[PDB]
Amino acid sequence: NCEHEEIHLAGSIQPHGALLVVSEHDHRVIQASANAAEFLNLGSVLGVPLAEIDGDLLIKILPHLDPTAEGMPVAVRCRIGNPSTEYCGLMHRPPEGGLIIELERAGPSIDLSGTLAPALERIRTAGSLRALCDDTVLLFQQCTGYDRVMVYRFDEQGHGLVFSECHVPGLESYFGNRYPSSFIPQMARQLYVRQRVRVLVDVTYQPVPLEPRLSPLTGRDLDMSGCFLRSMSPIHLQFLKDMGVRATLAVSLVVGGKLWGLVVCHHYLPRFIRFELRAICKRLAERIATRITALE
Template sequence: MTPGDTSAALARATDNCAKELIHLPGSIQPHGFMLVLDPHSLAVLQVSDNVQRWLGEPAAWWLGRVLPELLHGGEQVVRLLAERASEEHKPVHVADVRFAVGTYQGPPIALMVHRYDSVLIAEFEPASDVLAAYASLYPLVRTFIGQLQGADSIEQVCAQAVAEVKRITGFGRVKAYRFDPAGDGLVLAEQADEGYPSYLGLCFPASDIPPQARALYCANRIRVIEDANYVAAALLPALNPLTGQPLDLSHAALRSVSPVHLQYMRNMRTLASMSISIVVRGRLWGLISCHHAEPRPVRFQSRTACELLGSVLSLQIESMELQVRNQRLLGVRQQIVQLLSAMADRDSVRDGALALSDTLLGFVQARGAAIITASSCDLVGDAPDRQHVLALTDWLAERGGHEVFHTDNVSRDIPNLPALGRQVGGLLAVAISEIHSHYLIWFKP
């Protein structure tokens, strides 16, 4: 296969990932089982085909049967269901239940339910001691919330969150990363056991997480894969009988995941993972990502604690970003006043800007600047060579118009000035004359 063939194959694979309907997998992960219920009669409409392994009766046997008749204390469970399964889509723990039918003789099974896609989706997983679990998890979450008060930076709060998630879950490696405007993810904090490679400071390309996966991360704030080698359990029948369409499992904890993602995990020598979404002002800001080299269960109490931790972290990041933004705006206003005063005192944009060169750079947090007039080209700070700045001025003049021009990738957006792209990464240019090619230009490395 030639390099061109490889690139084409990768492009096709990426395009296919972006089109995959991952919210409609038609199957679940097998560490639990699922009953899909009519919201009014509580009759079973769909069932995961691994129910026989759990309860002894084949999948077809469960269809049409009514939930209260299947459980010990079924009427009490129904009352709890009415109280706790609200119209929100988030799965909630209703009770630990025992089945009155089938051959299962083991301990109680945790029942979690949410309403979505015109049905009640009931998920069943191994139960654990709820009181003991919450008693041990509450101090950890409380400690984390207290630590946030003393954090000085977003990197520090991410590091604290990573430490708490690792303490709660025991995953071998836990990292936090944020997405930039292009969707690439930069790892800000990490804790890893011996033997796990470190990704701290590395950048993951946006194509690793296709758009529909990012939408699901916003809708469902936590996702667990206990074993990347699992064999999915199909839903029977394949279509939601109330809609005639594949069942939407966007909010289901047991939702099966893309085979492409499972291969991605195996390529990273990861057999278990958990992701916690960091959502700020309604957008996916970043993720806390947990990896383990061996299969690893995460009970719903731990998931609930981690989800709460993620929500608190999201709010803290939003508050810190707002504070930084407000401080930045206040500083910009002060710098504008200083620059305008200097220009007015000297009756010259050029002289005023040169008199306050540090303020000129700080105004846009640049490393270099250029002041272009009909008679001069003045360079400030770490600016490109004069001939490259003049070539840029000619390019700006040829573009016409007097709008602000900016780019964070000079090589990409001004390809006919390759030498300039080798000296700077981004620039901002503002025309200061409607008649002549006069500009203020700022540069970043």
């Protein structure tokens, strides 16, 4: 590889959310994505006390600052700005740098009450790894609506194989394609064992830089390992561009503490899935991983 890009130190986010970093000691926003004020209908954000941004959010955050019961990551409802808009705030604490709050607009979410059960039932009947992975791609297509869904499985040599695939009729089948191990470097795989869902809304996005770049608390790049809005490697973006893919969802399949493979979805237009469905997807994938795990 390809093992040297520090993808967790991206210094920037995708533009469909905003990112705030709050000091644990004084609760001011000490670092933010450059779009944050525009995104949140605020005049300014940098240097502003969280009490000014939204008092109710500060109240929600305070108990999480107890080192004996941090209770993060956590997803909280809040209303920010004037005019006021509802957001889901996804908050976590990196080892150093302060408290990170990533905000997505609340919006319509996909409804799974009539369609999730038949797909889950099918998974439950799978008696082989073939059946299980085929059923996995149908389940995730049915829950998410992506144009193409794959199980990307690492073989015994670490090569990537598109082991199962479904897609809307007329699109290219990547089923059976095999790729070098370095197309997903070990450093990336290691991150994906911890950060189990990634959503790339538009491959062509203009990265939104953090302001300032370096954390004021450390003088170093912000650790963005746990940020759902993190900008992704330009090499990977280029890969997807050269395929003509416009958007992706990927969910880790973790077996034995290692990345066994991924559920990888492609869309040919921009696409976002909101917090709850990301969580559902993460969980489904863990359940499927338990079954793999049992199947060999």
